[PDB]
Amino acid sequence: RTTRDDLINGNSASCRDVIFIYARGSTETGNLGTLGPSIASNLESAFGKDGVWIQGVGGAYRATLGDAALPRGTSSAAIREMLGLFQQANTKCPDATLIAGGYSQGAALAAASIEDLDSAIRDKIAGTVLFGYTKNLQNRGRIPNYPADRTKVFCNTGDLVCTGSLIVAAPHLAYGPDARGPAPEFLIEKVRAVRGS
Protein backbone atom coordinates (compact mmCIF):
# COMPACT_ATOMS: atom_id res chain seq x y z
CA ARG A 1 0.00 0.00 0.00
CA THR A 2 2.99 2.30 0.59
CA THR A 3 4.20 2.39 -3.03
CA ARG A 4 2.15 3.97 -5.83
CA ASP A 5 3.59 4.93 -9.21
CA ASP A 6 0.34 5.52 -11.12
CA LEU A 7 1.76 8.43 -13.14
CA ILE A 8 4.95 6.63 -14.13
CA ASN A 9 3.10 3.40 -15.00
CA GLY A 10 0.06 5.05 -16.53
CA ASN A 11 -0.87 5.04 -20.22
CA SER A 12 -0.94 8.51 -21.76
CA ALA A 13 -3.77 7.36 -24.03
CA SER A 14 -5.95 6.89 -20.94
CA CYS A 15 -4.96 9.73 -18.61
CA ARG A 16 -6.75 10.16 -15.27
CA ASP A 17 -8.62 13.46 -14.72
CA VAL A 18 -6.79 14.04 -11.44
CA ILE A 19 -3.14 13.37 -10.58
CA PHE A 20 -1.99 13.46 -6.94
CA ILE A 21 1.75 13.79 -6.23
CA TYR A 22 2.78 13.18 -2.63
CA ALA A 23 6.07 13.33 -0.68
CA ARG A 24 6.50 11.19 2.46
CA GLY A 25 8.10 12.12 5.76
CA SER A 26 11.62 11.43 7.02
CA THR A 27 12.52 7.73 7.32
CA GLU A 28 9.14 6.59 5.96
CA THR A 29 8.80 3.58 3.65
CA GLY A 30 7.83 3.12 0.00
CA ASN A 31 6.98 6.43 -1.63
CA LEU A 32 3.79 7.21 0.34
CA GLY A 33 4.81 6.47 3.94
CA THR A 34 2.21 6.44 6.72
CA LEU A 35 -0.27 9.15 5.66
CA GLY A 36 -0.25 8.81 1.87
CA PRO A 37 -2.30 5.56 1.58
CA SER A 38 -5.16 7.02 3.69
CA ILE A 39 -5.44 10.09 1.46
CA ALA A 40 -5.20 7.89 -1.65
CA SER A 41 -8.07 5.55 -0.72
CA ASN A 42 -10.36 8.53 -0.09
CA LEU A 43 -9.42 10.15 -3.41
CA GLU A 44 -10.15 6.84 -5.18
CA SER A 45 -13.57 6.74 -3.51
CA ALA A 46 -14.41 10.24 -4.77
CA PHE A 47 -13.07 10.06 -8.34
CA GLY A 48 -12.97 6.30 -8.91
CA LYS A 49 -9.93 4.08 -9.42
CA ASP A 50 -9.45 5.16 -13.03
CA GLY A 51 -10.34 8.77 -12.29
CA VAL A 52 -7.28 9.51 -10.18
CA TRP A 53 -3.59 8.63 -10.35
CA ILE A 54 -1.66 8.44 -7.08
CA GLN A 55 2.08 9.08 -7.44
CA GLY A 56 4.57 9.11 -4.56
CA VAL A 57 7.92 10.88 -4.82
CA GLY A 58 10.50 8.11 -4.93
CA GLY A 59 13.70 7.88 -6.95
CA ALA A 60 16.33 10.24 -5.56
CA TYR A 61 14.08 11.24 -2.64
CA ARG A 62 15.46 9.00 0.12
CA ALA A 63 13.69 10.90 2.95
CA THR A 64 16.93 11.10 4.92
CA LEU A 65 16.30 12.69 8.35
CA GLY A 66 19.49 14.76 8.19
CA ASP A 67 18.45 16.47 4.95
CA ALA A 68 15.68 18.29 6.81
CA ALA A 69 18.45 20.55 8.16
CA LEU A 70 19.56 21.70 4.67
CA PRO A 71 18.65 25.29 3.56
CA ARG A 72 15.39 24.39 1.83
CA GLY A 73 14.45 21.70 4.32
CA THR A 74 15.41 18.87 1.96
CA SER A 75 18.11 18.03 -0.60
CA SER A 76 18.57 19.53 -4.07
CA ALA A 77 18.34 16.02 -5.53
CA ALA A 78 14.95 15.49 -3.91
CA ILE A 79 13.60 18.79 -5.32
CA ARG A 80 14.80 17.82 -8.82
CA GLU A 81 12.94 14.49 -8.44
CA MET A 82 9.60 16.10 -7.50
CA LEU A 83 9.96 18.81 -10.17
CA GLY A 84 10.51 16.01 -12.67
CA LEU A 85 7.26 14.35 -11.62
CA PHE A 86 5.23 17.57 -12.03
CA GLN A 87 6.83 18.00 -15.45
CA GLN A 88 6.01 14.38 -16.37
CA ALA A 89 2.38 14.92 -15.35
CA ASN A 90 2.17 18.10 -17.42
CA THR A 91 3.59 16.34 -20.48
CA LYS A 92 1.83 12.98 -20.18
CA CYS A 93 -1.58 14.42 -19.25
CA PRO A 94 -1.97 18.12 -20.24
CA ASP A 95 -5.64 18.29 -19.21
CA ALA A 96 -5.42 16.66 -15.80
CA THR A 97 -5.97 18.75 -12.68
CA LEU A 98 -3.06 18.33 -10.24
CA ILE A 99 -3.12 18.16 -6.44
CA ALA A 100 -0.18 17.68 -4.11
CA GLY A 101 0.79 17.05 -0.54
CA GLY A 102 3.63 16.28 1.80
CA TYR A 103 4.39 15.39 5.39
CA SER A 104 7.34 16.59 7.44
CA GLN A 105 10.45 16.77 5.19
CA GLY A 106 8.03 15.91 2.38
CA ALA A 107 6.05 19.08 3.19
CA ALA A 108 9.23 21.17 2.83
CA LEU A 109 9.97 19.28 -0.42
CA ALA A 110 6.48 19.99 -1.79
CA ALA A 111 6.82 23.70 -0.90
CA ALA A 112 10.32 24.01 -2.41
CA SER A 113 9.29 22.18 -5.60
CA ILE A 114 6.12 24.26 -6.06
CA GLU A 115 8.12 27.45 -5.47
CA ASP A 116 10.61 26.54 -8.25
CA LEU A 117 8.06 25.13 -10.67
CA ASP A 118 7.28 26.88 -13.95
CA SER A 119 4.20 29.01 -13.30
CA ALA A 120 2.14 27.35 -16.06
CA ILE A 121 2.42 24.00 -14.26
CA ARG A 122 2.16 25.40 -10.73
CA ASP A 123 -1.12 27.09 -11.68
CA LYS A 124 -2.60 23.66 -12.48
CA ILE A 125 -2.20 22.49 -8.85
CA ALA A 126 -5.72 23.08 -7.56
CA GLY A 127 -4.87 22.37 -3.93
CA THR A 128 -1.96 21.32 -1.72
CA VAL A 129 -2.04 19.84 1.80
CA LEU A 130 0.94 20.02 4.16
CA PHE A 131 1.14 18.04 7.44
CA GLY A 132 3.79 18.87 10.06
CA TYR A 133 5.12 21.59 7.76
CA THR A 134 8.80 22.07 8.74
CA LYS A 135 8.97 25.54 7.18
CA ASN A 136 5.66 26.70 8.68
CA LEU A 137 7.11 29.51 10.78
CA GLN A 138 9.74 30.53 8.23
CA ASN A 139 7.23 30.78 5.39
CA ARG A 140 4.47 32.17 7.61
CA GLY A 141 2.18 29.24 6.75
CA ARG A 142 2.43 29.74 2.99
CA ILE A 143 4.08 28.07 0.01
CA PRO A 144 6.05 30.79 -1.86
CA ASN A 145 4.44 31.91 -5.16
CA TYR A 146 1.32 29.84 -4.41
CA PRO A 147 -2.11 31.15 -3.33
CA ALA A 148 -3.29 30.87 0.26
CA ASP A 149 -6.77 29.70 -0.77
CA ARG A 150 -5.28 26.62 -2.43
CA THR A 151 -3.15 25.77 0.59
CA LYS A 152 -4.16 23.87 3.72
CA VAL A 153 -1.64 23.40 6.53
CA PHE A 154 -2.15 20.86 9.32
CA CYS A 155 0.15 21.78 12.20
CA ASN A 156 -0.73 20.30 15.59
CA THR A 157 -0.26 22.23 18.81
CA GLY A 158 2.96 20.95 20.32
CA ASP A 159 4.44 19.88 16.97
CA LEU A 160 7.77 21.66 17.30
CA VAL A 161 8.61 21.50 13.59
CA CYS A 162 5.75 23.97 13.01
CA THR A 163 7.35 26.55 15.29
CA GLY A 164 10.83 26.63 13.77
CA SER A 165 12.48 23.58 15.33
CA LEU A 166 13.55 20.17 13.96
CA ILE A 167 12.78 18.27 17.15
CA VAL A 168 10.30 15.41 16.72
CA ALA A 169 7.70 15.30 19.51
CA ALA A 170 4.55 13.15 19.87
CA PRO A 171 2.15 15.62 18.15
CA HIS A 172 4.26 15.30 14.96
CA LEU A 173 3.08 11.67 14.73
CA ALA A 174 -0.61 12.43 15.23
CA TYR A 175 -1.76 13.40 11.75
CA GLY A 176 -3.60 10.14 11.05
CA PRO A 177 -7.14 11.60 11.59
CA ASP A 178 -6.35 14.60 9.36
CA ALA A 179 -5.15 12.31 6.55
CA ARG A 180 -8.39 10.28 6.80
CA GLY A 181 -10.80 13.20 6.74
CA PRO A 182 -10.09 16.94 6.38
CA ALA A 183 -7.07 16.57 4.07
CA PRO A 184 -8.85 14.54 1.36
CA GLU A 185 -12.02 16.60 1.98
CA PHE A 186 -10.05 19.76 1.12
CA LEU A 187 -8.38 18.23 -1.94
CA ILE A 188 -11.72 16.93 -3.27
CA GLU A 189 -13.39 20.31 -2.76
CA LYS A 190 -10.58 22.17 -4.57
CA VAL A 191 -10.68 19.80 -7.54
CA ARG A 192 -14.48 20.06 -7.83
CA ALA A 193 -14.31 23.86 -7.55
CA VAL A 194 -12.41 23.99 -10.84
CA ARG A 195 -13.61 20.84 -12.60
CA GLY A 196 -17.29 20.96 -11.69
CA SER A 197 -19.26 17.70 -11.31
mmCIF file of C-alpha atoms in Angstrom:
data_model
loop_
_atom_site.group_PDB
_atom_site.id
_atom_site.type_symbol
_atom_site.label_atom_id
_atom_site.label_comp_id
_atom_site.label_asym_id
_atom_site.label_seq_id
_atom_site.Cartn_x
_atom_site.Cartn_y
_atom_site.Cartn_z
ATOM 1 C CA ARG A 1 0.000 0.000 0.000
ATOM 2 C CA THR A 2 2.991 2.304 0.586
ATOM 3 C CA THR A 3 4.196 2.386 -3.033
ATOM 4 C CA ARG A 4 2.154 3.974 -5.825
ATOM 5 C CA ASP A 5 3.590 4.933 -9.209
ATOM 6 C CA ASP A 6 0.341 5.519 -11.120
ATOM 7 C CA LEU A 7 1.758 8.427 -13.136
ATOM 8 C CA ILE A 8 4.951 6.633 -14.129
ATOM 9 C CA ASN A 9 3.104 3.401 -14.997
ATOM 10 C CA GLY A 10 0.055 5.054 -16.529
ATOM 11 C CA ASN A 11 -0.869 5.038 -20.219
ATOM 12 C CA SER A 12 -0.944 8.509 -21.756
ATOM 13 C CA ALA A 13 -3.774 7.363 -24.025
ATOM 14 C CA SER A 14 -5.950 6.895 -20.937
ATOM 15 C CA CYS A 15 -4.965 9.734 -18.606
ATOM 16 C CA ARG A 16 -6.749 10.161 -15.268
ATOM 17 C CA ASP A 17 -8.617 13.460 -14.720
ATOM 18 C CA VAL A 18 -6.791 14.039 -11.437
ATOM 19 C CA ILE A 19 -3.140 13.369 -10.577
ATOM 20 C CA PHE A 20 -1.985 13.460 -6.939
ATOM 21 C CA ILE A 21 1.751 13.795 -6.233
ATOM 22 C CA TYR A 22 2.782 13.176 -2.631
ATOM 23 C CA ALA A 23 6.065 13.333 -0.675
ATOM 24 C CA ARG A 24 6.497 11.190 2.462
ATOM 25 C CA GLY A 25 8.104 12.122 5.764
ATOM 26 C CA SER A 26 11.617 11.432 7.017
ATOM 27 C CA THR A 27 12.525 7.729 7.318
ATOM 28 C CA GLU A 28 9.144 6.586 5.960
ATOM 29 C CA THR A 29 8.797 3.577 3.651
ATOM 30 C CA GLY A 30 7.830 3.120 0.003
ATOM 31 C CA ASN A 31 6.979 6.425 -1.629
ATOM 32 C CA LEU A 32 3.789 7.214 0.341
ATOM 33 C CA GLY A 33 4.805 6.467 3.939
ATOM 34 C CA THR A 34 2.210 6.436 6.723
ATOM 35 C CA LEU A 35 -0.268 9.147 5.659
ATOM 36 C CA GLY A 36 -0.251 8.812 1.867
ATOM 37 C CA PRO A 37 -2.300 5.561 1.584
ATOM 38 C CA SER A 38 -5.163 7.022 3.685
ATOM 39 C CA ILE A 39 -5.445 10.086 1.463
ATOM 40 C CA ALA A 40 -5.203 7.886 -1.646
ATOM 41 C CA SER A 41 -8.070 5.552 -0.716
ATOM 42 C CA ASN A 42 -10.359 8.529 -0.086
ATOM 43 C CA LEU A 43 -9.421 10.145 -3.410
ATOM 44 C CA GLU A 44 -10.154 6.843 -5.178
ATOM 45 C CA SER A 45 -13.565 6.740 -3.509
ATOM 46 C CA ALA A 46 -14.405 10.236 -4.771
ATOM 47 C CA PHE A 47 -13.072 10.056 -8.339
ATOM 48 C CA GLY A 48 -12.974 6.300 -8.909
ATOM 49 C CA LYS A 49 -9.926 4.080 -9.424
ATOM 50 C CA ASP A 50 -9.445 5.165 -13.031
ATOM 51 C CA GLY A 51 -10.344 8.765 -12.293
ATOM 52 C CA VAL A 52 -7.278 9.508 -10.183
ATOM 53 C CA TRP A 53 -3.587 8.626 -10.353
ATOM 54 C CA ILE A 54 -1.662 8.437 -7.079
ATOM 55 C CA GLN A 55 2.077 9.084 -7.438
ATOM 56 C CA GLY A 56 4.566 9.114 -4.565
ATOM 57 C CA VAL A 57 7.915 10.885 -4.820
ATOM 58 C CA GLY A 58 10.502 8.108 -4.928
ATOM 59 C CA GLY A 59 13.696 7.882 -6.948
ATOM 60 C CA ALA A 60 16.327 10.242 -5.562
ATOM 61 C CA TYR A 61 14.079 11.236 -2.640
ATOM 62 C CA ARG A 62 15.460 9.000 0.121
ATOM 63 C CA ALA A 63 13.687 10.898 2.946
ATOM 64 C CA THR A 64 16.930 11.101 4.925
ATOM 65 C CA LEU A 65 16.299 12.694 8.346
ATOM 66 C CA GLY A 66 19.491 14.758 8.188
ATOM 67 C CA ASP A 67 18.452 16.472 4.954
ATOM 68 C CA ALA A 68 15.678 18.290 6.808
ATOM 69 C CA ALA A 69 18.446 20.553 8.157
ATOM 70 C CA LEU A 70 19.560 21.697 4.669
ATOM 71 C CA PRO A 71 18.654 25.285 3.557
ATOM 72 C CA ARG A 72 15.387 24.385 1.828
ATOM 73 C CA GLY A 73 14.452 21.700 4.318
ATOM 74 C CA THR A 74 15.405 18.868 1.956
ATOM 75 C CA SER A 75 18.109 18.033 -0.604
ATOM 76 C CA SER A 76 18.567 19.535 -4.075
ATOM 77 C CA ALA A 77 18.344 16.020 -5.529
ATOM 78 C CA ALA A 78 14.951 15.490 -3.908
ATOM 79 C CA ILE A 79 13.601 18.794 -5.317
ATOM 80 C CA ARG A 80 14.799 17.817 -8.818
ATOM 81 C CA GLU A 81 12.936 14.490 -8.436
ATOM 82 C CA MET A 82 9.601 16.099 -7.502
ATOM 83 C CA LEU A 83 9.956 18.805 -10.171
ATOM 84 C CA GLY A 84 10.505 16.014 -12.671
ATOM 85 C CA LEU A 85 7.255 14.346 -11.622
ATOM 86 C CA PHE A 86 5.235 17.568 -12.027
ATOM 87 C CA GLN A 87 6.831 18.001 -15.453
ATOM 88 C CA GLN A 88 6.014 14.384 -16.374
ATOM 89 C CA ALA A 89 2.381 14.920 -15.352
ATOM 90 C CA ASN A 90 2.169 18.100 -17.421
ATOM 91 C CA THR A 91 3.595 16.336 -20.483
ATOM 92 C CA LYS A 92 1.834 12.982 -20.177
ATOM 93 C CA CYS A 93 -1.582 14.422 -19.250
ATOM 94 C CA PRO A 94 -1.969 18.119 -20.235
ATOM 95 C CA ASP A 95 -5.639 18.289 -19.214
ATOM 96 C CA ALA A 96 -5.415 16.656 -15.802
ATOM 97 C CA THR A 97 -5.970 18.751 -12.681
ATOM 98 C CA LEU A 98 -3.060 18.326 -10.243
ATOM 99 C CA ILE A 99 -3.121 18.161 -6.439
ATOM 100 C CA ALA A 100 -0.181 17.683 -4.112
ATOM 101 C CA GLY A 101 0.787 17.051 -0.541
ATOM 102 C CA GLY A 102 3.627 16.280 1.800
ATOM 103 C CA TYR A 103 4.390 15.394 5.391
ATOM 104 C CA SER A 104 7.342 16.591 7.444
ATOM 105 C CA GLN A 105 10.448 16.768 5.194
ATOM 106 C CA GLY A 106 8.033 15.906 2.379
ATOM 107 C CA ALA A 107 6.055 19.080 3.188
ATOM 108 C CA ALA A 108 9.227 21.170 2.828
ATOM 109 C CA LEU A 109 9.972 19.280 -0.419
ATOM 110 C CA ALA A 110 6.478 19.986 -1.785
ATOM 111 C CA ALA A 111 6.818 23.697 -0.902
ATOM 112 C CA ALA A 112 10.315 24.009 -2.411
ATOM 113 C CA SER A 113 9.285 22.182 -5.595
ATOM 114 C CA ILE A 114 6.124 24.258 -6.058
ATOM 115 C CA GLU A 115 8.118 27.446 -5.474
ATOM 116 C CA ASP A 116 10.611 26.535 -8.254
ATOM 117 C CA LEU A 117 8.056 25.129 -10.674
ATOM 118 C CA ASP A 118 7.280 26.883 -13.946
ATOM 119 C CA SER A 119 4.198 29.008 -13.299
ATOM 120 C CA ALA A 120 2.145 27.354 -16.056
ATOM 121 C CA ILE A 121 2.418 24.000 -14.260
ATOM 122 C CA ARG A 122 2.161 25.404 -10.727
ATOM 123 C CA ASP A 123 -1.117 27.091 -11.678
ATOM 124 C CA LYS A 124 -2.600 23.655 -12.479
ATOM 125 C CA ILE A 125 -2.199 22.485 -8.852
ATOM 126 C CA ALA A 126 -5.718 23.079 -7.563
ATOM 127 C CA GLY A 127 -4.865 22.366 -3.927
ATOM 128 C CA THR A 128 -1.963 21.320 -1.716
ATOM 129 C CA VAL A 129 -2.042 19.843 1.802
ATOM 130 C CA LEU A 130 0.935 20.024 4.164
ATOM 131 C CA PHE A 131 1.145 18.038 7.438
ATOM 132 C CA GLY A 132 3.786 18.871 10.058
ATOM 133 C CA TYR A 133 5.123 21.592 7.765
ATOM 134 C CA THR A 134 8.795 22.071 8.741
ATOM 135 C CA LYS A 135 8.971 25.539 7.180
ATOM 136 C CA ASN A 136 5.656 26.695 8.682
ATOM 137 C CA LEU A 137 7.106 29.514 10.776
ATOM 138 C CA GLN A 138 9.740 30.527 8.231
ATOM 139 C CA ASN A 139 7.233 30.778 5.391
ATOM 140 C CA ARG A 140 4.467 32.170 7.605
ATOM 141 C CA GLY A 141 2.184 29.239 6.751
ATOM 142 C CA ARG A 142 2.426 29.737 2.990
ATOM 143 C CA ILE A 143 4.084 28.067 0.007
ATOM 144 C CA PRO A 144 6.049 30.787 -1.857
ATOM 145 C CA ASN A 145 4.437 31.913 -5.158
ATOM 146 C CA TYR A 146 1.316 29.837 -4.414
ATOM 147 C CA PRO A 147 -2.111 31.149 -3.329
ATOM 148 C CA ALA A 148 -3.292 30.866 0.264
ATOM 149 C CA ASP A 149 -6.774 29.701 -0.769
ATOM 150 C CA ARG A 150 -5.284 26.618 -2.433
ATOM 151 C CA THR A 151 -3.149 25.775 0.588
ATOM 152 C CA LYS A 152 -4.155 23.871 3.716
ATOM 153 C CA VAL A 153 -1.644 23.395 6.529
ATOM 154 C CA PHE A 154 -2.147 20.857 9.318
ATOM 155 C CA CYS A 155 0.153 21.781 12.201
ATOM 156 C CA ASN A 156 -0.732 20.300 15.590
ATOM 157 C CA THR A 157 -0.261 22.229 18.813
ATOM 158 C CA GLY A 158 2.961 20.947 20.325
ATOM 159 C CA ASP A 159 4.435 19.877 16.970
ATOM 160 C CA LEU A 160 7.769 21.660 17.302
ATOM 161 C CA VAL A 161 8.606 21.498 13.586
ATOM 162 C CA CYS A 162 5.746 23.973 13.013
ATOM 163 C CA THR A 163 7.350 26.550 15.286
ATOM 164 C CA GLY A 164 10.828 26.635 13.770
ATOM 165 C CA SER A 165 12.482 23.577 15.325
ATOM 166 C CA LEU A 166 13.553 20.173 13.958
ATOM 167 C CA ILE A 167 12.782 18.271 17.155
ATOM 168 C CA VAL A 168 10.299 15.408 16.724
ATOM 169 C CA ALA A 169 7.702 15.296 19.508
ATOM 170 C CA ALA A 170 4.555 13.149 19.874
ATOM 171 C CA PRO A 171 2.146 15.617 18.153
ATOM 172 C CA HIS A 172 4.263 15.299 14.965
ATOM 173 C CA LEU A 173 3.076 11.673 14.728
ATOM 174 C CA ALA A 174 -0.609 12.427 15.234
ATOM 175 C CA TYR A 175 -1.755 13.401 11.750
ATOM 176 C CA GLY A 176 -3.604 10.142 11.047
ATOM 177 C CA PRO A 177 -7.140 11.596 11.593
ATOM 178 C CA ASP A 178 -6.348 14.597 9.361
ATOM 179 C CA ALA A 179 -5.153 12.313 6.550
ATOM 180 C CA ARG A 180 -8.392 10.285 6.804
ATOM 181 C CA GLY A 181 -10.799 13.201 6.742
ATOM 182 C CA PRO A 182 -10.086 16.941 6.379
ATOM 183 C CA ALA A 183 -7.075 16.569 4.067
ATOM 184 C CA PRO A 184 -8.845 14.540 1.365
ATOM 185 C CA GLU A 185 -12.020 16.597 1.979
ATOM 186 C CA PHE A 186 -10.049 19.764 1.122
ATOM 187 C CA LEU A 187 -8.378 18.230 -1.944
ATOM 188 C CA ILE A 188 -11.716 16.932 -3.273
ATOM 189 C CA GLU A 189 -13.393 20.312 -2.755
ATOM 190 C CA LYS A 190 -10.580 22.172 -4.565
ATOM 191 C CA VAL A 191 -10.677 19.803 -7.544
ATOM 192 C CA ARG A 192 -14.482 20.055 -7.830
ATOM 193 C CA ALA A 193 -14.308 23.865 -7.547
ATOM 194 C CA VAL A 194 -12.406 23.995 -10.840
ATOM 195 C CA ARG A 195 -13.613 20.842 -12.601
ATOM 196 C CA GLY A 196 -17.288 20.960 -11.694
ATOM 197 C CA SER A 197 -19.257 17.702 -11.308
#
